[PDB]
UniProtKB/Swiss-Prot annotation, chain A:
It is found in: Vacuole membrane. Residues 114-142 form a coiled coil. Present with 55714 molecules/cell in log phase SD medium. It is a multi-pass membrane protein. This is V-type proton ATPase subunit a, vacuolar isoform. It comes from Saccharomyces cerevisiae (strain ATCC 204508 / S288c) (Baker's yeast). Changing residue 495 to A: Reduces assembly of V-ATPase complexes. Changing residue 639 to L: Reduces subunit stability. Residues 381-382, 444-491, 551-593, 649-669 are vacuolar. GO terms for molecular function: ATPase binding; phosphatidylinositol-3,5-bisphosphate binding; proton-transporting ATPase activity, rotational mechanism.
UniProtKB/Swiss-Prot annotation, chain D:
The keyword Ribosomal protein does not apply. The keyword Transport applies. The gene is VMA3. Residues 6-17 are cytoplasmic. This is V-type proton ATPase subunit c. Keywords: Hydrogen ion transport, Ion transport, Membrane, Transmembrane, Transmembrane helix, Transport, Vacuole. It comes from the Eukaryota.
Curated annotation (Swiss-Prot), chain E:
Coiled coil: none annotated. V-ATPase is a heteromultimeric enzyme composed of a peripheral catalytic V1 complex (components A to H) attached to an integral membrane V0 proton pore complex (components: a, c, c', c'', d, e, f and VOA1). This is V-type proton ATPase subunit f. Disulfide bonds: none annotated. It is found in: Endoplasmic reticulum membrane; Vacuole membrane. Its main location: endoplasmic reticulum. GO terms for biological process: endosomal lumen acidification; Golgi lumen acidification; proton transmembrane transport; vacuolar acidification. It comes from Saccharomyces cerevisiae (strain ATCC 204508 / S288c) (Baker's yeast). GO terms for cellular component: endoplasmic reticulum membrane; fungal-type vacuole membrane; Golgi membrane; proton-transporting V-type ATPase complex; vacuolar proton-transporting V-type ATPase complex; vacuolar proton-transporting V-type ATPase, V0 domain. Keywords: Endoplasmic reticulum, Membrane, Transmembrane, Transmembrane helix, Vacuole. One of its GO terms (molecular function) is RNA endonuclease activity. Residues 22-44 are cytoplasmic. It is a multi-pass membrane protein.
From Swiss-Prot, chain F:
Pfam families: vATP-synt_AC39. The keyword NAD does not apply. It comes from Saccharomyces cerevisiae (strain ATCC 204508 / S288c) (Baker's yeast). It is a peripheral membrane protein. V-ATPase is a heteromultimeric enzyme composed of a peripheral catalytic V1 complex (components A to H) attached to an integral membrane V0 proton pore complex (components: a, c, c', c'', d, e, f and VOA1). This is V-type proton ATPase subunit d.
Length: 734, 195, 155, 52, 63, 314
């Protein structure tokens, strides 16, 4: 089995001669494998005539009432123990999972019976909850009076103030421990209201108004003995109502306990049973021979498994069917199956949220394994902050087996599926923070410096060091605290941003030649690659080899003036000759030759592809897209410098405002000060620098890949692999 | 709104007060432009270069970003396909950043003498108006690319009928920003450092 | 005092320190207020997204931290007898992280309010939200880069 | 206390219990004026200290 | 747990700071804004190191 | 239009994403071939309705049920957009509902004047126009009494049963006409004057068409205010209004109101920094929830002759 991580997998268009006797049973043994992405063989048929839709509608009406059963498991609050024996039965590795017989037709006449009885049981136990809440509010009070829903007091006072005279009596009282209802299905507050009037026709209007709203007004006796008589009459009927209500609630809820510890078992083989039918609809049938052809996409290095699976099914089915899954060649576009293990799946996942690749294209997620953490590492770059991120990811990597099953939170599956994309960040950012000479805000003094300060000086005078050597690994620690520590670091980082962005732009760009030479398209090489390679290499390669050339020429023992690359760039294109001060001999006769070559390429890029209609427009919007984006991308690798300056410098102030204040020769005040302003440092440092600053850096190392790398070689989109498989789907999705 | 017509009466009255009393040559904008420090103009041109560039870059970003987040509620694939509209809104801020780095290199301390000389006043005016040219041209190109990339977001709701034409006018706004960049690089092309 | 260092020369520096934190805090306020009204309207009915949807106010707060750094850095270079050269580079660092951090704090506010109302009707927008949000954040960081670069030329 | 005045006085007629929460907001709002009175009394103490 | 891991980092980070003041390291006491008498500012974070070792072994009994 | 996307950017981006859920003219041809309501449900789930009938059964799927689940799915989207609006748009979407609650106080009075139940009548009432006093409508049947008693606290307070309906509705549409020219910017000025005028037109034509004085109950905001109001005021027969309606070039030959509305609505989406989009979506989606209902009535009882009367410009 050849792996599919550099390009995609070689996909084979198999088609299945499945007979009508095992069409329902053989679909499981390849649904259990999880290999075949089927095609829409019925995309012109009306969606209600796919010749299994009366067998999907009848188990959608079973899954419609399983999510009604789970709504009863959320109303009456049963814990839903959810025995996972179905996951233990079908292990999703091999085709040993047996099918189900006529047990599905028992799940239909079982699921329907529960819906009818449950609907009657719920209607009856909510109808006696209506008269329960009717009597529990009548025992609160025990002229017109009653109770409303406690949010209408402002508008019942408002309408009763305007309708009798503007001069009427009113009294309001609250209700403690509010009750639920039937229409709102929620515990709503209530308030007792009392009005008073002497008119006969006024009373009728008031009663009608109160009745119309969310109220149920009553009539009480105008005596204390009548109130004590009716209170004993209502509480005598209400205790008999508690007597009838408790038995029916217990019968209902314990009948829910008969399914609620067990419903998750017989939901899985219903969602899995509907999936097979849905897969079956995408097929064709023959009137003469009872066959069922369903042409789908298998990887070609997986045709060995299908023969064995077919043979095993044939052994366990005495019809002696041909089962001829024979492969044909097609003109369609097969999917892109990349074969990723647990290390390269977190890197493949963030490179195809920008797009699923073309079939058998250069996968971008194989270079993203090293390019994405390293790019982040440039921008983050600290041994202390990289050590807190190794220990943040190392803990997850060390015991991944016991995190493989856990509660799996929202920001904990995202932090766990990329545990290797966080570990390889913090190791590359520990090497980068060792090249930046960077522990948490300070430097490691571990090699001999190449900068020797002079012998004697006065306290409070400017001192200029002399170079006696070069520091072997990284920046000198003699650049720490100096006044021009930014005039060296910025120039070095900003030229590092150009050099590491040009190399990532040309390693990514070479992929285009890696797959215009694989697809056997020599027109696109001479029409797109070589005119774009000459232009990109000249305009920005010429820039990139002059950082390294100015870094490899000593401009202080030669007596020559050190040039300016920025100045040199802006007079290659504006007055192409006339160098201010030269960089290498015979410069202008090649510095205008580079311009001539680039200028010749701009016609070539556009004219060659149509001349070898629609491709003339598609090329003329591709050349002007290529020309003004290479001048945009190279200027947009400066984010690496910007976020690295805004991490190193920002941390250097976060040290000063918490820890460096807390130093002093103090006995009792200091040992509290440098403990409190250490917990005001480490907590703040983790919160700001590792999380907010770190996320900012990983979204530009995600942006450099989505637009500055995958612009060049990641042409087109493809339909994802996504095979027909079985997954232990949750009941929570309802 | 009334204070505009109250500080215009003061300018008319104080103009005619100086003019009628023979002292109208006291309101001289030349001696103002010649006694004023060039580091004012040069660094109120650098800081207002990256300032108005970022102000237009962000103005474009919340126009087309809040459009394609609203357009991505139904079609979520637009936010990873129409992120080219928020590239060119942000390269506006890159173009105001490059000018800042180039301009800064021309910003050195001058001596007590040779401070209000010809070349120092030149490079003060030059970095002032060039930082306004590339700061406000990038402010307008960031607004333009934002309001034409927001019509790229609610037209990528429709599948493919218009995005190949919309992109052409998306990059026509980028070309204007680039042409503004190469004007501020030629306004301060002959401006020297402070000497 | 002299011609190089007059008495009004630390006005630019003092104004710059004040400008760096008042303009970033006004933009971070507008970012917090529109994102917080998008959160406290979002998580009325979807309370389990309360830690994903809070990243616009964290990211708008990082603009305030950027503003704070500029104010501290240029208050370290203030002084009574300072040159007028370093007065205007402290005012350039002031209003270059200032008026850039307010526009970046505004754009975090509008994009973050549209995002946290959009990444709850469809959760697939949460990856698209922050990548727009980062762009509206680093425009304040681009303002900060100019300030650091321009404060590197004091004395 | 104008805005929380007609805020707290209009909703008190529908619920007579929202009065101890109204007055602590009015104390909080009232103190700001007294903060301005503290600085206005500390500035006015400094008119005598060596005014020359 | 928060104070256990916070004191585990505390002991390691603070003590190596006490050793980078007790040895008079150039990156800590080499400025003019330095904490003078490095072996006297060192005992402030020797005692601060071992008081985090107190919080570490005290909170390490509830684990 | 550089200030529109501040408060209305997510708003317009999602409303313009709802008009792509307006199922097109090909989406009715495959939807008029069902002959059972189950099949229609089966292929209405492929649209941007997106399986909204996933909770109802299939044996008991009434014609009305689809009419009220599709309208509930409309109205939750409307007050989803409405509670995300600023003070220039939250008011405008409230003024949309103000013309709905006039049709609700017009139906509560003519339902409570006769012998009818509050609950049954309340179910038919449109739920975008719903104020807290509206379930009463039973203190008095007098028109004068209603204003002081029940309409005083409503936002209908600055505004026999159809007489006070047009008395409310003309003053409403005048107040809604000079609001959209005051606080709403330029790309929706020409929209909310012409589209709104059309609404004043096909209401003023229905005044004379339903009347066969009248000058005070007719709204005057549209193209028939200066000239055709006097000619339509003294029209007593159908030929008088037929001769009066010939003066306008956009209304000649019509005396076809919703087809002219939908053709005037498809040009409203042609602007794309305007807030007239949410009115065009509201009247388009309210159109296509009575197109689906008109199809489902021809499917519930077999009426195959008059199906193709649905009207979709989008």
């Amino acid at each position: 089995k050849e792996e599919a991580i550099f390009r995609s997998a070689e996909m084979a268009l198999v088609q299945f001669y499945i007979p009508q006797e095992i069409s329902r049973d053989s679909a499981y043994t390849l649904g259990q494998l999880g290999l075949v992405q089927f095609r829409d063989l019925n995309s012109k048929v009306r969606a209600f005539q796919r010749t299994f839709v009366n067998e999907i509608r009848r188990l959608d009406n079973v899954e419609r009432q399983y999510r009604y059963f789970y709504s009863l498991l959320k109303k009456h609050d049963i814990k839903l123990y959810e025995g996972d024996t179905d996951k233990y039965l079908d292990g999703s590795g091999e085709l040993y999972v047996p099918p189900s017989g006529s047990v599905i037709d028992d799940y239909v006449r079982n699921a329907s019976y529960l819906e009818e009885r449950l609907i009657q049981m719920e209607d009856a136990t909510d109808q006696i909850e209506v008269q329960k809440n009717d009597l529990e509010q009548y025992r609160f009070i025990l002229y017109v009076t009653g109770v409303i829903a406690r949010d209408k007091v402002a508008t019942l006072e408002q309408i009763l103030w305007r309708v009798l005279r503007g001069n009427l009596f009113f009294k309001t009282v609250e209700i403690e421990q509010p009750v639920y209802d039937v229409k709102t299905r929620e515990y709503k507050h209530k308030n007792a209201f009392i009005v008073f009037s002497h008119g006969d026709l006024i009373i009728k209007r008031i009663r009608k108004i109160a009745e119309s709203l969310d109220a149920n007004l009553y009539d009480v006796d105008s005596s204390n003995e009548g109130r004590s008589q009716q209170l004993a009459k209502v509480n005598k009927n209400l205790s008999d109502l508690y007597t009838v209500l408790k038995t029916t609630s217990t019968t209902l809820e314990s009948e829910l306990y008969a399914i609620a510890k067990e419903l998750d078992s017989w939901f899985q083989d219903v969602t899995r049973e509907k999936a097979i039918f849905e897969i079956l609809n995408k097929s064709n049938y023959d009137t003469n021979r009872k066959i069922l052809i369903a042409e789908g996409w298998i990887p070609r290095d997986e045709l060995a498994t299908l023969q064995a699976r077919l043979g095993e099914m044939i052994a366990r089915l005495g019809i002696d069917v041909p089962s001829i899954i024979q492969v044909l060649d097609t003109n369609h576009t097969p999917p892109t199956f990349h074969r990723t293990n647990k290390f390269t799946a977190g890197f493949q996942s963030i490179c195809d949220c920008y797009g699923i690749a073309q079939y058998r294209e250069i996968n971008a997620g194989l270079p993203t394994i090293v390019t994405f953490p390293f790019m982040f590492a440039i921008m983050f770059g600290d041994m202390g902050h990289g050590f807190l991120m190794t220990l943040a990811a190392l803990s997850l990597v060390l015991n991944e087996k016991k995190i493989n099953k856990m509660k799996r939170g929202e920001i904990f599956d995202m932090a766990f599926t990329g545990r290797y994309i966080i570990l390889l960040m913090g190791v590359f950012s520990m090497y980068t923070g060792f090249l930046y000479n960077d522990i948490f805000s300070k430097t490691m003094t571990i090699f001999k410096s190449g900068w020797k300060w002079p012998d004697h000086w006065k306290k409070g005078e400017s001192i200029t060091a002399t170079s006696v050597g070069t520091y072997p690994i990284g920046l000198d620690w003699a650049w720490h605290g100096t006044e021009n520590a930014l005039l060296f670091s910025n120039s070095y980082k900003m030229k590092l941003s150009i050099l590491m962005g040009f190399i990532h732009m040309t390693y990514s760009y070479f992929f285009s030649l890696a797959n215009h030479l694989y697809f056997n398209s020599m027109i696109d090489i001479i029409g797109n690659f070589i005119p774009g390679l000459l232009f990109m290499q000249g305009i920005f390669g010429y820039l990139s080899v002059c950082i390294v050339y100015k870094w490899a020429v000593d401009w202080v023992k030669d007596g020559k003036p050190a040039p300016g690359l920025l100045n040199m760039l802006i007079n290659m294109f504006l007055s192409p000759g006339t160098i201010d001060d030269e960089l290498y001999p015979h410069q202008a006769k090649v510095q205008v030759f580079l311009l001539l070559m680039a200028l010749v390429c701009i016609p070539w890029l556009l004219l060659v592809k149509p001349l070898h209609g629609d491709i003339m427009i598609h090329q003329v919007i591709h050349t002007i897209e290529f020309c003004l984006n290479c001048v945009s991308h190279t200027a947009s690798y400066l984010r690496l410098w910007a976020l690295s300056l805004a991490h190193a410098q920002l941390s250097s102030v976060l040290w000063t405002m918490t820890i460096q204040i807390a130093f002093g020769f103090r006995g009792f005040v200091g040992v509290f000060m440098t403990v409190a302003l250490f917990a005001m440092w480490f907590a703040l440092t983790c919160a700001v620098l590792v999380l907010m600053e770190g996320t900012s850096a990983m979204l530009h190392s995600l942006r450099l890949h989505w637009v500055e790398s995958m612009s060049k070689f990641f042409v087109g989109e493809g339909l994802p692999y996504e095979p027909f498989a079985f997954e232990y789907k949750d009941m929570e999705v309802a | 709104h009334f204070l505009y017509y109250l500080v215009l009466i003061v300018v008319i009255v104080y103009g005619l007060y100086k003019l009628f009393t023979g002292h109208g040559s006291d309101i001289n904008f030349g001696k103002f432009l010649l006694r004023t420090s060039p580091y004012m103009w040069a660094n109120l041109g650098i800081a207002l270069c990256v300032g108005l560039s970022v102000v237009g870059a962000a103005w474009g970003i919340f126009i087309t970003g809040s459009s394609m987040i609203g357009a991505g509620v139904r079609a979520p694939r637009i936010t990873t396909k129409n992120l080219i509209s928020i590239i060119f809104c942000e390269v506006v801020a890159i173009y105001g950043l490059i000018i800042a780095i180039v301009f800064s290199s021309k910003l050195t301390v001058a001596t007590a003498e040779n401070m209000y000389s010809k070349s120092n006043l030149y490079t003060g005016y030059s970095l002032f108006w060039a930082g306004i040219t590339v700061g406000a041209s990038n402010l307008i190109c960031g607004i333009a690319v934002g309001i034409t990339g927001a019509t790229a977001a609610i037209s990528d709701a429709a599948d493919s009928a218009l995005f190949v034409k919309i992109l052409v006018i998306e990059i026509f706004g980028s070309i204007l920003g680039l042409l503004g960049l190469i004007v501020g690089l030629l306004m301060a092309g002959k401006a020297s450092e402070f000497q | 005092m002299t011609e190089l260092c007059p008495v009004y020369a630390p006005f630019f520096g003092a104004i710059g320190c004040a400008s760096a934190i008042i303009f970033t805090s006004l933009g971070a306020a507008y970012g917090t207020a529109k994102s917080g009204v998008g959160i406290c309207a979002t998580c009325v009915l979807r309370p389990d997204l309360l830690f994903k949807n809070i990243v616009p106010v964290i990211m708008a707060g990082i603009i305030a931290i950027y503003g704070l750094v500029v104010s501290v850095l240029v208050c370290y270079s203030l002084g009574q007898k300072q040159a007028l050269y370093t007065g205007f580079i402290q005012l350039g660092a002031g209003l270059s992280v200032g008026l850039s951090g307010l526009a970046a704090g505004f754009a975090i506010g509008i994009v973050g309010d549209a995002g946290v109302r959009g990444s709850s009707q469809q959760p697939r927008l949460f990856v698209g939200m922050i990548l727009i949000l980062i762009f509206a954040e680093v425009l304040g960081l681009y303002g900060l880069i100019v300030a650091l670069l321009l404060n590197s030329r004091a004395t | 206390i104008g805005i929380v005045g007609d805020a707290g006085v209009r909703g008190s007629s529908q619920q007579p219990r929202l009065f101890v929460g109204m007055i602590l907001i009015l104390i909080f709002a009232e103190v700001l004026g007294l903060y301005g009175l503290i600085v206005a009394l500390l500035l006015n103490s400094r008119a005598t200290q060596d005014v020359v | 747990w928060c104070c256990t891991v916070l004191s585990a980092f505390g002991v390691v980070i603070l003590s190596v700071i006490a050793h980078l003041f007790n040895t008079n390291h150039e990156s800590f006491v080499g400025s003019i804004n330095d904490p003078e008498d490095g072996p006297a500012v060192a005992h402030t974070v020797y005692l601060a190191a071992l008081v985090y070792l107190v919080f570490f072994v005290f909170c390490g009994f509830q684990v | 239009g550089v200030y529109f996307n501040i408060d209305n950017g997510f708003i317009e981006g999602v409303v313009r994403g709802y008009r792509n859920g307006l199922l097109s003219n090909n989406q009715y041809i495959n939807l008029t071939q069902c002959d059972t309501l189950e099949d229609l449900k089966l292929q209405l789930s492929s649209t941007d309705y997106g399986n909204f009938l996933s909770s109802v059964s299939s044996e008991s799927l009434t014609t009305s049920l689809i009419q009220e689940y599709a309208s509930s799915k409309l109205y939750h989207e409307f007050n989803y957009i409405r509670d995300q609006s600023s003070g220039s748009t939250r008011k405008f979407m409230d003024y949309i509902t103000y013309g709905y609650m006039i049709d609700n106080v017009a139906l509560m009075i003519t339902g409570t004047i006769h012998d009818r139940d509050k609950g049954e009548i309340l179910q038919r009432c449109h739920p975008l126009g719903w104020f807290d006093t509206l379930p009463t409508l039973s203190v008095a049947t007098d028109l004068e009494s209603l204003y002081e008693t029940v309409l005083v606290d409503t936002p209908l307070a600055p505004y026999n049963i159809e007489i006070i309906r047009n008395k409310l509705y003309k003053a409403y549409l005048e107040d809604f006409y000079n609001f959209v020219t005051e606080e709403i910017p330029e790309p929706a000025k020409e929209c909310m004057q012409t589209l709104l005028g059309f609404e004043a037109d096909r209401r003023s034509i229905n005044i004379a068409l339903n009347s066969l004085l009248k000058s005070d109950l007719l709204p005057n905001i549209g193209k028939l205010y200066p000239l055709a109001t006097f000619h339509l005021a003294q029209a007593q027969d159908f030929e008088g209004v037929r001769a009066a309606l010939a003066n306008v070039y956009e209304y000649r030959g019509f005396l076809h109101f919703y087809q002219l509305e939908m053709e005037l609505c498809r040009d409203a989406f042609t602007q794309q920094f305007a807030i007239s989009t949410v009115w065009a979506w509201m009247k388009s989606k309210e159109q296509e929830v009575r197109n689906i209902t008109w199809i489902a009535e021809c499917i519930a009882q077999n009426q195959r002759e008059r199906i193709n009367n649905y009207i979709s410009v989008y």
